[PDB]
Amino acid sequence: MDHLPIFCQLRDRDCLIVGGGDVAERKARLLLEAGARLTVNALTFIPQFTVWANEGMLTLVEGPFDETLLDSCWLAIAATDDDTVNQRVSDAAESRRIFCNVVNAPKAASFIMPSIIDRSPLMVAVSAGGTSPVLARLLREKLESLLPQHLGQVARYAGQLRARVKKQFATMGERRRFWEKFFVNDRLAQSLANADEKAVNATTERLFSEPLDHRGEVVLVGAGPGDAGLLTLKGLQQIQQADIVVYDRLVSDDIMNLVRRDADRVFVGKRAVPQEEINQILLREAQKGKRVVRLKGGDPFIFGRGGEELETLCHAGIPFSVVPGITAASGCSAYSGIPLTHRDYAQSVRLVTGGGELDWENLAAEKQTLVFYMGLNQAATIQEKLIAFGMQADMPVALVENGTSVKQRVVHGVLTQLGELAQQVESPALIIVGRVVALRDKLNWFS
Amino acid sequence: MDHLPIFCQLRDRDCLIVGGGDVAERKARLLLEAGARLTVNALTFIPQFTVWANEGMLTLVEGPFDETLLDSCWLAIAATDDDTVNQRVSDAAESRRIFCNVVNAPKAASFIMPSIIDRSPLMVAVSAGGTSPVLARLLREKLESLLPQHLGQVARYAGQLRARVKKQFATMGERRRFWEKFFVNDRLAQSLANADEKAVNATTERLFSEPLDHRGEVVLVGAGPGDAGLLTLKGLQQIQQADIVVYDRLVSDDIMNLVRRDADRVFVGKVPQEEINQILLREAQKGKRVVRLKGGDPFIFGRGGEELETLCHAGIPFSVVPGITAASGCSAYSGIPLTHRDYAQSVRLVTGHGELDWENLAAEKQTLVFYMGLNQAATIQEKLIAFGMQADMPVALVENGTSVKQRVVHGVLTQLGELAQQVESPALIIVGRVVALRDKLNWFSNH
Ligand SMILES: Nc1ncnc2c1ncn2[C@@H]1O[C@H](CSCC[C@H](N)C(=O)O)[C@@H](O)[C@H]1O
Ligand SMILES: Nc1ncnc2c1ncn2[C@@H]1O[C@H](CSCC[C@H](N)C(=O)O)[C@@H](O)[C@H]1O
Ligand SMILES: [Cl-]
């Protein structure tokens, strides 16, 4: 072992930073977050130090490095640009047996500052001894995406409950299985976050009363339009903790690979399937006691037929929640370079399908952006009947197929070519109509 | 944070353990592995301690607690069963400003010993500070399953190439891009694992020979409506690697916790557009990774349709990460789907601050979403009524959607004026029959 990691309790302990630049500012902010009583010594200070001082959060000593400021210090940080000054700081702290960090020379120091994931009281720290800062940040970013930030509140509720858990589950296996359920229960985490005490004690005793086997809930998760990177953090966390994932073909293969592999997969899609038995699959599995995730393309509440499922769940007592996704309009907008609103261009955006009878006097009006979902089929009926209501023959139209994926194709023309453009593409495609289409020239970044 | 993690260099520094039992043994084993000059002072020793003193790896001091043995120490550990003795030790350590650990007492000591995952020279440390030891074990065991066995060899080799990387690459960014490609080359990993030197050398020379890009870029990232879990995975990648992050009023404080600690932050808030652009323009022209962080989605009422031409006119590469828009975030979190089987089959996103076409907005069977229409709410009510919307149409106002401070008021269209006086910005107005579904779909809390 090259370094001993220790977690230091710093509240009202004296600490010294030498330096007054932005490096020293980052260090000072960490130590203030830790509750340190902080003195800063520097020849000059960036103004963020004088505001912290005015608000009585630190102490400033303008001048050269004064070894006697270390006199009652627990930690020293040399954060200047002068290796000479840092070495004098480092040497003065060594003789007083004060742990000292040198920002630019981590080998010169008696301690190193690692990358930190703060879910306090829960804390994770990563370092490789200075050999690889970029590896630490790479690991920090993956850790950040996996640990929900309300985990800390769940942590402290746990500690206040270990007497009840131990007095109810005899074996340690029984206890670990309970804790494993406790720490991934999301109505619990949301209730502690939102400070709803009725829902905490409700969820608390529902956790104690149901069998250790059971953990029935259903989560409606938006997978977004295609790109695995457009999943939400909450979404990725939910499909990692799931026992069964129910998915359609509108969920891209890359999203599916993010499903941790001991989960059961249920495909409920096209081949070459009514929503009614989909409701009963979800119903069945939740009442067997499984964490069911329903993955849907895009956003669940935008042409998802996703509300119809949940009111069946609400009438059986099955807890549920919903994680929104990037809808196709927003993804294709961004990946094709067509903003949906802009300036003098479009006051409003309209999301519509292609069922029943629509109102095309309404759809034809100007100063709009029109986005057609599932419109490819009735597409010819759309060109002739927007022009037949006075909308200009020169209005740019665009079709985005497979938006946000590496197979994205965009065809753009003018309203009077709308049918011709149409089956140069296939489903799934969006039809976008309006002046905003004309700014793809200046705004397309996706190669 | 409640603790401050640090990685101490203990080689040739005196440490003192008080206690000579199995708990003292496990802490002694750790300090020995970190190179400490160890002294153990106890009435009695388990046999492993005498086996260590015979090899000259520690000094044993038999007898009761001697305070003077602290004099030259950098760390102290109270590991007796006697809690009176442990307190005399932590007292004697306090006065000397020596970080001290008390085994049966996490809240009583100035440092905590964390769980360690070791991939030397890489190291991950996990602690919940004694509030939840079992969360720390479950997490440590999950981390153990995500860190590849042979990651330590990749880190070690990185340590040996730093001198060469810094000599051959002038700028910080060029070094970062080298390391970014180094740490995700699968083949270099397996070659290091198999001690295949010629294969390591061939990939290494080729990696050093690659042309490295020298451009800064501006990334527009959607933060989503507030909840930090609603950021996309890509958006998190961006704000964890960014050099500077330009952000607004409407980026919640929990998203900012995701911004990399070493990044610079610039706030905007009446700061008009032409100063933002030239801030963006001048920062990227210096080769820095620039993230523009905006609330919701950048291309929906984002004003971000002209930021991008100024950059395209300048030769600055740019990209766009879509975000969850306030409509689909507030929809999911108030229990109000934007579309539904027989309630609404089109969604209209409208602004507030010729003018609006009210005959079209008042049309049947659509959901209306008003962005920043709080100050204009009495007009919206008047106009929709005059163009034929029924007086009893359900309306809802979502304030601070997806945040811990979310508030929803709701009612009928003849109440829309009065309702707006009960909330403040930022807030959405949802108009349509879907609003009535909240009483069957609200899985979120009570405001
Ligand atoms: N990746 C994609 N690219 C282009 N259009 C897409 C798309 N994904 C979905 N669509 C559109 O959405 C239709 C399915 S309706 C499902 C909508 C989804 N819940 C959402 O919010 O996006 C398809 O017929 C197609 O018109
Ligand atoms: N968390 C939230 N809850 C309710 N309304 C919100 C909100 N965040 C933004 N808004 C609305 O959005 C307006 C800002 S316009 C920018 C919104 C962003 N581009 C998006 O896609 O959502 C505010 O006036 C408010 O009406
Ligand atoms: Cl490192």
Numbering used by the authors:
A (entry chain B): 1 to 272, 277 to 358, 363 to 455
B (entry chain A): 1 to 270, 277 to 359, 364 to 457
Please quote the authors directly.
Siroheme is the modified isobacteriochlorin tetrapyrrole used by siroheme-dependent sulfite and nitrite reductases (SiR/NiRs) in catalyzing the six-electron reduction of sulfite to sulfide or nitrite to ammonia. CysG is encoded by a gene fusion between a C-terminal SUMT (CysGA) and an N-terminal bifunctional dehydrogenase/ferrochelatase (CysGB). The N-terminal enzyme module, CysGB, is a three-domain bifunctional dehydrogenase/ATP-independent class III ferrochelatase12 that performs the final two steps of siroheme biosynthesis. The C-terminal enzyme module, CysGA, is homologous to a well-studied class of SAM-dependent uro’gen III methyltransferases (SUMTs) that catalyzes the methylations to generate precorrin-210,13.
D104 has been implicated in its chelatase activity but its exact role is unknown. Alteration to asparagine results in an enzyme with a severe growth defect, 10-fold lower dehydrogenase activity, and 200-fold lower chelatase activity. The D104N variant is also sensitive to addition of Co2+, but with the same dose–response as CysG. The D104A and D104N structures were determined to ensure that there were no gross structural defects that arose from the alterations that might impact their function. Indeed, both altered enzymes were crystallized and the structures are largely similar to Met8p. The asparagine side chain is pointed away from the tetrapyrrole binding pocket, toward the Rossmann fold, as D104 does in the apo structure. Presumably, in the D104N altered CysG, the asparagine can reorient and partially act in the same capacity as the aspartic acid in catalyzing dehydrogenation and chelation. Asparagine rarely serves as a nucleophile, but there are some examples of proteases that use an asparagine in this capacity, so it may be sufficient to allow basal catalysis. It may also be sufficient to coordinate the water molecule that is poised over the tetrapyrrole nitrogens to prepare the tetrapyrrole for metal insertion, albeit less efficiently than the aspartate. As regards metal ion specificity, however, D104N is no more sensitive to increasing cobalt dose than CysG, suggesting that metal ion specificity does not depend entirely on the nature of the ligand that recruits the metal to the tetrapyrrole.
